[PDB]
Amino acid sequence: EKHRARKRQAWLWEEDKNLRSGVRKYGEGNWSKILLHYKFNNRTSVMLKDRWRTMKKLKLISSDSED
């Protein structure tokens, strides 16, 4: 709805940070906790899961290389 146009909009800077810090602070696979701890604009456990999975797999977070 909050776009009133085709193609889903991307995630917000603040939300990505919230999620990143959330997973780092409380671990992965606890979207409910993350969602409650950090103040997201309009997200759900499903959107958090989607975003993180897509990010770690395709938007290669990295910063954990052996060398």
UniProtKB/Swiss-Prot annotation:
Induction remark: Expression is tightly regulated during the cell cycle; levels are low in G1 and S phase and increase during G2 phase and mitosis.
Residue ranges the UniProt entry marks as DNA-binding: 31-56
Tissue localization of expression: Highly expressed and ubiquitous. Isoform Pin2 predominates.
Domain HTH myb-type: residue ranges: 3-60
Record-annotated membrane-spanning stretches: none
Record localization: Nucleus; Cytoplasm, Cytoskeleton, Spindle; Chromosome, Telomere
Self-association and partners: Homodimer; can contain both isoforms. Found in a complex with POT1; TINF2 and TNKS1. Interacts with ATM, TINF2, TNKS1, TNKS2, PINX1, NEK2 and MAPRE1. Component of the shelterin complex (telosome) composed of TERF1, TERF2, TINF2, TERF2IP ACD and POT1. Interacts with RLIM (via N-terminus). Interacts with FBXO4. Interaction with TINF2 protects against interaction with FBXO4 and subsequent polyubiquitination and proteasomal degradation. Interacts with GNL3L; this interaction promotes homodimerization. Interacts with TIN2. Interacts with RTEL1.
Domain remark in the UniProt entry: The acidic N-terminal domain binds to the ankyrin repeats of TNKS1 and TNKS2. The C-terminal domain binds microtubules. The TRFH dimerization region mediates the interaction with TINF2.
Function per UniProt: Binds the telomeric double-stranded 5'-TTAGGG-3' repeat and negatively regulates telomere length. Involved in the regulation of the mitotic spindle. Component of the shelterin complex (telosome) that is involved in the regulation of telomere length and protection. Shelterin associates with arrays of double-stranded 5'-TTAGGG-3' repeats added by telomerase and protects chromosome ends; without its protective activity, telomeres are no longer hidden from the DNA damage surveillance and chromosome ends are inappropriately processed by DNA repair pathways.
Protein name: Telomeric repeat-binding factor 1
Organism: Homo sapiens (Human)
Encoding gene, per UniProt annotation: TERF1
